[PDB]
Design a protein around this nucleic acid. Sequence first.
DNA 1: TAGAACAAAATGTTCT
DNA 2: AAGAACATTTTGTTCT
Lengths: 79, 73
Amino acid sequence: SHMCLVCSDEASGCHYGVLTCGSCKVFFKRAVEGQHNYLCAGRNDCIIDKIRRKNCPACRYRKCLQAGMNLEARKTKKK
Amino acid sequence: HMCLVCSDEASGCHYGVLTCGSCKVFFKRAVEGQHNYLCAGRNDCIIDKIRRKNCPACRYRKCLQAGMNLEAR
DNA sequence: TAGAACAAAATGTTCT
DNA sequence: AAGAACATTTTGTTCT
Ligand SMILES: [Br-]
Ligand SMILES: [Zn+2]
Ligand SMILES: [Zn+2]
Ligand SMILES: [Zn+2]
Ligand SMILES: [Zn+2]
């Protein structure tokens, strides 16, 4: 267990509840805090991996949610 | 009137094709620079004004296929 | 019409 | 672990 669950690159730790690399960490934070009105140019199942994760922010963010990322994971594991 | 690659607003005829300024500039960069664009779908993404930034592989392919060529005039 | 430059958006890394 | 600040990459506009 040492892979990012969103893009399958090398995980750098748990962030927002999920083992992810640092790039998905800050992507998710930015997506959750701001606008994430993204539009898939395919069929909403683009392949999110180390080279292609730049391609589709819409599917990357759905992959984050699917993997379970959530901003209040910190205060969550406190319960 | 409208870009042949991404359906944005065509600014004129660039490298052989009626394209927009985004696509014009994207095209030169694609062929001159070196990157390896890989499609994350099915090699058939939708390239419109918003989605053109998502898949440079498909955008680039659309460019070539629409006849864009650095050598034209 | 093409380039250059400039500017902005989107992604990723370091935190001596 | 979470997040700021820094840094890069990628895209788009404008002014030659
Ligand atoms: Br920078
Ligand atoms: Zn990742
Ligand atoms: Zn997608
Ligand atoms: Zn275009
Ligand atoms: Zn594509």
